[PDB]
Design a protein around this ligand. Structure first.
Ligand code: HEM
Ligand code: HEM
Lengths: 361, 362
């Protein structure tokens, strides 16, 4: 029903993946360090209430008639819904408050990549809040109300709703399918592998930035799918793109989805073969992305795709090498990166006295 | 996760209990060949039968001819029906084609201008629509996508709307949802079991004057933006005066329970419930079935939220038109703006495995 908010790491990275996503990036409007820290403390107090399913402050109602309610109220009567709130700090934050020398070296700016068509307005951001929950209205309410508490100190830069499986009807032991119809998530880091989390995901003290110990680095890519084109490709082109069959998700030449792949039996530019850690010196990622469908553009086409999210111990040794290796991906015919951002995700809130970003400020 | 039956005297997705998710699509017809269009309708009915039962369209999502693209795009494979319903409607601009002029119902009236109307002509109108409602949004998207695929060349998508969450109720025995303004929405609606209220207020009847419409309904859709910034700085008393009900329980002003009957004269003269209530509109009654939406930011540092409002009624001229006309002085107007609009005639149900969408019209 609820995920614990306190811990060594922030929840919502290695904790079980919830049904829905509302991702928002904020820009900071204050120059005042104190004002900003005060906001971080207020945000943490509100996150505590929200993740336990209570209203922020003095509730959505029953207060002074002459005052606006503390909480906007649209979550009353709903359950915590495994809601998690994960905050991240973007590179541009460290140009404020005199933090320029505390920017972690692992929070590297992404290269320009072949094919990039990055929409400036839907990229970047001084900080982000990732709201995950099984009920989309719980997630929205959270973002809605943090934006409200921050008004005059932050604004919403861009926002993205997303969805994965629906846990009210499908088994937790069944891989969800992306909007291209293929199983997505088969060969991923799972939250149970604390050994691979420690090696590939969490910032370690001796990494170079002590305030980030227990943190992680997040890469967000908004990836449009050319759906009508994909849907016109033969079943064989589709399976050739990935190196797995569509019905079962088995690596080509194999029988069950979870059979370990034989890379030489795949086409040289098949996605799985180019993404595999064996093709990238061991580089391994934790994918935690969500599908999106926003509507339709002015040409009739479905404005849909994958809001790709990756956690990694170092952006330099995680996302950049693998993405670089996709230069020739057969899938590139069918997708387009149109938004991008990177964030440093601080360690967890240890107890009821701690706050978001305490190690940095 | 059960299925909702597709056959009936009426189309599902109207009096049916309100599912969590919506994907709504308006289509324009790009063929002039009437026989082309009827075959479309027949092929779509057959896909619909599979889709509502949790089955793949045509010959399935895989295991077909390798050189050929699959019949079903496959992103619903291994998912339950999820109470998917598919409801089709014909917009007034459709009867300009195929020699249907004299068949347009009288009850499908174009809507007049309303004060404050700021209607985007792109996200308005449509030759026909499909309302897809499901508890899983992947299921709802998959249906729309596949329907539009089957219709490549005979129809294209003029505009769509996804509702991430319901703000309506047809089952008063279950909790009333809240809209993005924080109020319960749907308390005094028409319930799917109130058959006599549905017959009186929702289903078109034979003597109404358009026979092929017997058993159908008429749909009004309004895309309504909410000025949430303005709303969120209003006092709690102001928010309660706008509606006539308190925020917490959702009870009419001065009473204690959500479902106690509102006593209209204790509400402000311009309170929403006071003005929308049937007794203020000579009995006019609507079946509300709308959904919340949010379409990113506004590029001004704020979230972009609204309500995709849908009303089914027996006659547009006696349902939505008079009630919306009485809302000219509604206190709510200060916080909302109508920015999209369309009306549709929703035909009778597909009666059996041999029938098809629109058979009574064609
Ligand atoms: C629209 C965008 C994308 C789609 C539809 C897609 C799809 C898939 C599919 C179907 C699989 C096989 C099942 C699985 O293990 O998840 C896969 C695997 C994988 N993908 Fe992607 N992908 C996309 C973008 C990316 C990007 C941008 C990256 C990295 C920058 C990436 C990295 C990986 C990795 C590391 C694997 C696991 C490979 C293995 O170890 O077997 N993917 N992807
Ligand atoms: C953003 C726009 C709107 C919002 C937020 C909203 C909200 C509400 C709320 C909170 C109620 C009271 C609870 C209930 O009984 O359902 C209500 C009732 C009602 N509304 Fe609205 N509403 C909106 C637009 C409209 C429109 C456009 C119409 C008709 C054109 C309408 C017609 C009604 C009716 C008929 C009732 C039932 C009143 C009764 O008989 O007691 N509403 N609405």
């Amino acid at each position: 029903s609820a995920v614990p908010f306190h811990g060594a790491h922030q929840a919502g990275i290695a904790t079980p993946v919830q049904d829905r996503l509302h991702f928002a990036a904020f820009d900071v409007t204050t120059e005042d360090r104190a004002a900003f820290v005060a906001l971080l403390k207020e945000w943490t107090a509100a996150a505590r209430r929200l993740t336990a399913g209570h209203a922020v402050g003095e509730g959505a109602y029953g207060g002074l008639p002459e005052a606006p309610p503390d909480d906007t109220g649209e979550a009353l009567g709903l359950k915590p819904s495994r809601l998690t709130l994960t905050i991240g700090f973007g590179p541009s934050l460290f140009t404020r408050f005199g933090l320029a020398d505390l920017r972690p070296e692992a929070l590297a700016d992404l290269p320009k990549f072949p094919g990039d068509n990055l929409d400036r307005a839907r990229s970047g951001g001084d900080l982000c809040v990732q709201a995950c929950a099984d009920d989309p209205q719980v997630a929205v309410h959270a973002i809605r109300n943090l934006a409200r508490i921050g008004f005059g100190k932050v604004v919403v830069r861009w926002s993205q709703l997303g969805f994965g499986k629906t846990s009210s009807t499908t088994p937790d032991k069944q891989t969800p399918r992306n909007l291209l119809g293929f199983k997505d998530g088969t060969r991923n880091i799972a939250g149970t592998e604390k050994d691979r989390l420690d090696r590939f995901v969490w910032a370690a003290e001796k990494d170079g930035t002590p305030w980030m110990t227990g943190g992680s680095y997040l890469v967000a890519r908004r990836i449009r799918m050319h759906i009508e084109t994909w849907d016109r490709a033969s079943l064989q082109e589709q399976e050739d793109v990935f190196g797995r069959d569509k019905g079962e998700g088995a690596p080509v030449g194999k029988a069950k989805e979870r059979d370990e792949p034989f890379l030489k039996a795949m086409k040289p530019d098949a996605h799985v073969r180019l993404a595999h850690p064996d093709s990238n010196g061991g580089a391994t990622l934790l994918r935690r992305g969500y599908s999106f469908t926003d509507g339709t553009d002015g040409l009739g086409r479905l404005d849909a795709g994958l809001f790709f999210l990756a956690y990694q111990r170092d952006i330099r040794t995680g996302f950049v090498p693998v993405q670089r290796n996709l230069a020739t991906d057969a899938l590139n015919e069918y997708i387009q990166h149109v938004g991008s951002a990177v964030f440093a995700v601080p360690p967890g809130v240890r107890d009821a006295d701690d706050w978001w970003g305490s190690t940095l400020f």
